[PDB]
Every structure is written in structure tokens, then in C-alpha cells.
């Protein structure tokens, strides 16, 4: 008779006792068990075809994607512990800077800058939310999927911060149009068309490997450097300490996303030909990222330098991965 | 060898039962009884087991053989007590 094991059968003989992270996150996807018929139904259904073309047939290859491990080792339990603390900090800032009348101290010029460069981000942040959640449902391993799961939750977090501050700003400056005008700015303002074209196109890149690259390796670094780093620095220098701190707080989530993205690229580079596959995709999407940064940052004060810095910082993210 | 699905009278489940194309209906019933009589159904020594096509209720003579029954592979058959 089969004897009881000390851990899960797929983890037995690991030498080191499996962590909580490994116990609850590994080898969970079962659609990868039968590549010819991922789902337990007719093999010609649209969804069968979708996973075969966009997951299994991706040029980004590896013999054992389930070996991937999130460097931060996030689990649902620890994700909520981590973020509940960070939200205690952010909500604390909102609460106390409000008590202080922080928004009433902003200049009219800056308030108008917020309406143009800050609040419309609710659309871009939600687009990232959609981008990372698609990665979740098409990635070849549960450990890759989970990183995308929590990343998606973070994008929703940013959307939420933005939605909250937008109402606060609207209450303080009823005449500006906060909450009402953002869709038109996102859809028609030249400063946003670079990012809008980039994310709209990236959103229909169904191959899991290309989605990862377009969204996590190219789009996010550009969005983060422009909207968090650049706008955040400007905000601080302009007297908006709340946004300066908020952007910095959200940047912590972005750093974590880069850590797991970097780990996945590292794993991918174990296979000959993958670096070239990734560089091909980066080369295809990078031009749109430059356009996004140029259109947004050039419209900001001291725009040309903001453009140079953002381009340099975002490229550095990929450079450090190889 | 030919597969049929046995729906034995008074049993609760239909079962896979491999018969032979040369089996008579009596021999089919016997092969089917093996999986139901004395397992989940009591014998009825005063009755005779007959084979009926489940879908339309066609009753096959005791001596007819599978080969001449016009059954689709895996066809469901009722094995009933008669007389």
C-alpha cells in the first residue's frame, strides 16, 4: 500500500521542507495536463483553440514553467497583511492631510495640471488592471499566474486611490470638472494619445509571452516613470505633498512587479533562443513606449528632461534583466 | 466480441457487458446476469431472462444471435424476467 508522504507528492524529495508559498501555489493548473485537449470537452471549442494558440504555441519556451517561483513569495494571506499595512499608511495620509486643508493650499495652476495629468489616469490604471488579469488567465503555470493575480489587485488599488482623490479634488474645486472630464481628456488630449495607443494595442496581444512583455516589460515601466516618478516629483516641487507621497507609495507595488518580471525573464533565459524572442517583442513595442513618454512628458514643465529621464529609467529596467 | 449496455431488471445501474456476436439472446442474458444476479438482484428461478432493445422495446427471441440482432455497438439492452 502507498505510504503517507511528508509533503505533496509533486514536492516530495525537495531536500528542504516546502514553504507555505510552495504548498499553496505550485502545479495548480490542470489545463496544461493535456496540450491537445486542455479542457474536458470537445477539442475544437473556441477556448480550446485559444489556449493552444496563445499559451502552448508561444515562442517563449521552457520545459518546466511550474518551476517558477515568485521572489517575494506572495500568498493571499501575506498579500493582504502587506497591503493592509500600506493602505493604513495611504488612508492615513488622505485622512490627515485633509484635516490639514492640504488641497486648499494648492495653486490654481497646479489644480488645473492635476485635471489634465493626474485624474485621467483612472483609465490607464484600469487598462493595466485588464492587462495583468489577462496575463493571469493565459500563463502556463500557477506560480506565474499568481504574481499576475496580485499585480492585478495592485492596479485596482491605484485606480481606487485615483477615484478617491478625484472626488476629493472635485469637492474642493467644483468648477474644474474633476470626475466629469477625464474620459474626454484620455480620449482626446494629445498628452495621453501616446499611452492610449500603446495600451489599446498591447491589450490585444493574446500570446501569453507577448502579453507579459508588452504589459510588464514595456508598458508598465513607461507608465510608472511618467505618471509616478515624473508627475510625483513635479507634484512635490509644486507643493502637492500628498501626490508626491501617494505616487511613491504606489511605486512600491511597481517595484514588486518588476521583481517577479525580472525573475521570469531570468528563468526564460535558461533556454536558448528566449532572450532573442523577448528582445524581438521589446523591439516591436518599445517605439510605442517612447511615443507614450514623449507625448505625456513633453507637455509637462521642463518636459524635455522628464522625457530623457523617463526613457532612461524605463530602459534600465529591461537592461538589468539582460 | 461486441459491447452492449446491460439494463438489468430491478437493478439500479446500466453496465458495460461484452458479449459475442455469436451469442444467442439466452447467452447474452447469462453474461449480463453475472453482473447483477446475486450482487444486487435476487434470482427468479421460475422466470426466464429475455433481451429487449432498450430504445424501442423490441423483444428478441431467445435463440436469436447478436450477429442477427442489428445492434449498434454499445447498444443498451433491457434484460427482463418473463413468463
Amino acid at each position: 500500500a502507498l505510504k503517507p508522504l511528508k509533503t505533496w507528492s509533486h514536492l516530495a524529495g525537495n531536500r528542504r521542507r516546502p514553504s507555505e508559498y510552495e504548498v499553496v501555489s505550485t502545479n495548480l493548473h490542470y489545463f496544461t495536463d493535456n496540450p491537445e485537449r486542455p479542457w474536458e470537452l470537445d477539442s475544437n471549442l473556441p477556448m480550446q483553440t485559444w489556449y493552444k494558440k496563445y499559451c502552448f504555441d508561444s515562442p517563449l519556451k521552457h520545459d518546466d514553467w511550474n518551476a517558477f517561483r515568485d521572489p517575494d513569495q506572495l500568498v493571499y494571506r501575506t498579500y493582504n497583511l502587506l497591503q493592509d499595512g500600506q493602505e493604513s499608511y495611504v488612508q492615513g495620509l488622505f485622512d490627515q492631510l485633509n484635516d490639514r486643508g492640504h488641497d486648499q493650499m494648492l495653486t490654481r495652476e497646479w489644480v488645473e495640471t492635476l485635471a489634465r495629468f493626474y485624474t485621467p489616469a483612472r483609465y490607464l490604471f484600469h487598462a493595466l488592471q485588464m492587462g495583468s488579469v489577462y496575463i493571469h488567465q493565459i500563463a502556463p503555470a500557477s506560480t506565474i499566474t499568481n504574481c499576475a493575480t496580485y499585480e492585478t489587485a495592485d492596479h485596482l488599488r491605484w485606480l481606487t486611490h485615483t477615484a478617491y482623490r478625484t472626488r476629493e479634488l472635485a469637492n474642493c474645486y467644483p468648477d474644474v470638472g474633476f470626475g466629469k472630464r477625464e474620459r474626454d481628456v484620455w480620449e482626446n488630449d494629445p498628452a495621453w494619445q501616446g499611452f492610449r495607443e500603446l495600451i489599446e494595442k498591447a491589450l490585444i496581444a493574446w500570446d501569453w509571452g507577448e502579453a507579459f512583455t508588452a504589459i510588464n516589460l514595456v508598458t508598465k515601466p513607461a507608465v510608472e516613470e511618467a505618471l509616478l516618478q515624473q508627475l510625483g516629483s513635479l507634484a512635490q516641487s509644486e507643493g502637492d505633498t500628498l501626490l508626491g507621497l501617494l505616487a511613491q507609495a504606489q511605486k512600491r507595488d511597481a517595484e514588486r512587479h518588476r521583481r517577479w518580471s525580472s525573475a521570469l525573464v531570468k528563468m526564460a533565459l535558461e533556454k536558448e533562443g528566449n532572450r532573442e524572442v523577448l528582445q524581438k517583442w521589446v523591439a516591436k513595442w518599445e517605439p510605442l513606449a517612447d511615443k507614450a513618454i514623449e507625448a505625456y512628458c513633453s507637455a509637462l514643465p521642463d518636459g524635455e528632461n522628464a522625457i530623457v529621464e523617463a526613457k532612461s529609467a524605463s530602459r534600465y529596467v529591461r537592461q538589468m534583466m539582460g | 466480441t461486441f459491447p452492449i449496455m446491460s439494463n438489468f431488471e430491478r437493478d439500479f445501474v446500466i453496465q458495460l457487458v461484452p458479449v459475442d456476436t455469436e451469442d444467442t439472446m439466452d447467452q447474452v442474458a447469462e453474461k449480463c446476469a453475472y453482473h447483477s444476479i446475486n450482487r444486487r438482484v435476487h434470482p427468479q428461478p421460475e422466470k426466464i431472462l429475455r433481451v429487449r432493445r432498450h430504445e424501442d422495446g423490441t423483444l428478441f427471441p431467445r435463440g436469436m444471435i447478436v450477429s442477427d440482432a442489428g445492434l449498434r455497438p454499445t447498444e443498451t439492452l433491457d434484460i427482463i424476467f418473463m413468463d
Partner: protein, 491 residues
Amino acid sequence: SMLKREDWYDLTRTTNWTPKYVTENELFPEEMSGARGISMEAWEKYDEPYKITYPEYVSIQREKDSGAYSIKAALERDGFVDRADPGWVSTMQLHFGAIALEEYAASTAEARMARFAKAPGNRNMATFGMMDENRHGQIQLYFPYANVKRSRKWDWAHKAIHTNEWAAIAARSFFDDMMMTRDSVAVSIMLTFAFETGFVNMQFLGLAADAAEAGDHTFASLISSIQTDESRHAQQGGPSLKILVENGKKDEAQQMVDVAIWRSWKLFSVLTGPIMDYYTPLESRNQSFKEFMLEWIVAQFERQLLDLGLDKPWYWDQFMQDLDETHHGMHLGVWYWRPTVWWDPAAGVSPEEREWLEEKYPGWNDTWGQCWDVITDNLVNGKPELTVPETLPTICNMCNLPIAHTPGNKWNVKDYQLEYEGRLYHFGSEADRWCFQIDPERYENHTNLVDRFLKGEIQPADLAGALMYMSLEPGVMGDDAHDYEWVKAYQ
């Protein structure tokens, strides 16, 4: 100071925009979105009844795990599992193996809606729903993990859905059809409305109560904690149905509900029915599976359908009748074929239990009781070999469950066969065959375990070969939960 949630909530779901660099159909592929000709503006009327924001979610859910994990740690050294009723241990082993990985798979079903629903409120609620199922998959892996050194059976909490054991196939058949291979709108209807709102919400409430009654507070706290998350994402189907009904799709909506409810019922008839009426000790049975269904499941569906402007499914009456039969057959099937599952099925046919069954189901002894009479006589008379099978039962090509029904004095077992494109299909019910007929291309070339056996895909082509094919070996292969102790009452 802080704003009131209601004052800024809408901005969190004011996220739709008019694409320009790609087309709307490219951004929202119909096969993934299922917008069904209904415009983006019309979908924006979607309004989830239960609202929640990110900071509220992480705070509330943090405390949820703090409590559940704390209770687990406090009761761990106690080893309740080592002295729990065998029928209860089996209930949990069946539970974890059948749903742990399907719970996790549901996060992808939620992700399908998060990315492809045209209703922005749906997209956000599905993001929370995605997180919820992530929690459920993880916590229902962490909890049984504590028992791996006790029996290889606990390894199936992770392994089961990775095998071709018949119960696992039946589970994937259901889940893959309801939530993994459907467009966003379909998922919200078939998964969140029909299955989660319609079955799981109440089921987990009863399961948590049963766990407490059995003395298992770790499992009671687990299930209990899990079900408080349900309605947060289970609510997603309701709004979708209103939109389909108020626009041109009442029939399309009705059909998805009809299919989803029936398939949910079949899975329920084998995974829940047997447990309530046979594994749960007689003195702990507050009500029968049928009573549970009428009081907590059926009436609720009728209420929900009426409020949505939908009708009771065409099979409703038959469904009502089957509450007296189906699960009894599923139980007898699982017990008779016990070596084919990963838990120890409990017969539940002692004199006292049979009295209860007769009371809860008039006519049981003259029907179901007769099969059990023969089985009992053989055990009493030393012929245990006649209580295990030497062949496979016929399997439904839709629900992938054995085709069984009323035996004994009111024999009424039927096979709803269908010849389609040169192949004979077998179905366990009128509704199961109908699910195939309204969308044959969705199930056409799928093969059930029997089909594979007959095709030569299981080698050696014998029972031992089939067990290996299903990854079953002594140690996890099932047997009578109480080791036939109940036979002593018959001598």
C-alpha cells in the same frame, strides 16, 4: 477626514472608453466577452448590489484569515482528525480532492470577466472575485496539507484534478463547461448565478454546521469563513441577466440558466446527496438531502427566476421527482465501485439508518433497499467478492456520472441514447441529452471513461489497467468507511 464610500464609489467603475487605435471587437473578442450585440452603453447599466472597495477588501479579508489560521493552529495538536467518525473523514477527503484545484481554477473564470466584461462594475467585482477564489484554492490546500502524514488520500487534495479518476473527470467536465470555456457574460450567469448563488452559498452553510456537529471546529471555521466571501462575487450573474432580458435576449439567458442549473444539480447529486443521507451519522442528521434541497435550494431558485423575469426550467417537475431518487443511485454506485474513488464510502444502511431512510423517502426499502439487501446477505454470508464490481457501469456522456435510477419493486432505470454522426451516445437523463443536443459541437468528440476503455486507450484493457489509468493504488483506493462494522447488526 474621509469621504463616505457612496460619494466616490462610481468613479471606481467609470472606466469604459471608446477605443481608437484598435476596434471594439478586437479589444473585446465576442468569444471571450459575449456582449451579444448589446452595446457598451447598455452594459454600463450593470449595477452590482453588494459594493466594496480595495481598502475595505484587504482589511476585512486580512482579519478573515487571521481568525481561520489562528483557529487551525490552536486545534492542530488536538488531532481531532484521528478520532473523528470515519464517515466525516471521508467527507473531507472527498471535499478537498474535488474542489481545491477547481476553486483555484475559478480565479481564472473570474479573470475572464475582469478582462472581457463590457460592464465596468462587473470587471471590478470579478477582480475581487478573482482574489476570493485565489484565497479559497490556497486555504483549502493549506488545511488538508496538515494531514498528509496520516494517509496518502490527503495528497489527492492536490492530485485529484490532475488524474483521470472518474470523479475528477466528472468535476472537470462540469467546471470546464460552466466557467473555463465560456464567454464573460456566460460565466457570470452559469457560474456566479446558477452555481455559486444557487448551490454553493447554502451548501457551505450546511456543511459548516455539519462540521461543527461532527466536532470538527477547524473545518467548520474554514468552510464558514469561506462562505462569507461567496456573495461578494456570486452576485455577478444577476445584473447580467437583467441586461440580457431587458434587451433582446430573454431566451438566450433562459437557456444558459437551464443548462447551468441541471449540470450543477448532477454534480450535487453525487458529491453532496450521499454525504447528507449516508455518511453523516444518523443522530446528526437535522434533515434529509431532499428536505435540504426543497427548503434551501429550490424555492430560492424559483424566487430568483421570477424576480429576473425568467421561467422555471422545462425540466423543473422531473427535477423535483428526482430528489427522491438520483442521489440514492449515486451513493450506491460510489459504494459498490468504492475501489475507484479516493475516499472510503460509508454504506449507511444499518437497521436504524434504513428506518430513517424509509421515513425520509417512503418506498426506499422496497426499491433501493433490495439492492442493499442482496449486498448485506453476501457480506453476512462471507461472499464479499460479490460486493465489488467486475465491469464498468455505463457513464453519461454529459455529466460523466453512472447512469442509475430506481431499482427493486419500482424499477425505472433509463438511458437517453442519441446517435449523432455515426456514434452512439448515452445519457443519464432527458436534460443531460438535451444539453448535448442544443450545442453538440461543444461535446461532440469528448470521450468518457467507458468510451476510452472501448477505444483501446486504457491498457492493459482490464480493471487493474483502468485503476492504473486513473492513478489509483492500494492505500488510496476506497473501501467501506466503517470497515463493515454495520454488518454485525445482521450478524
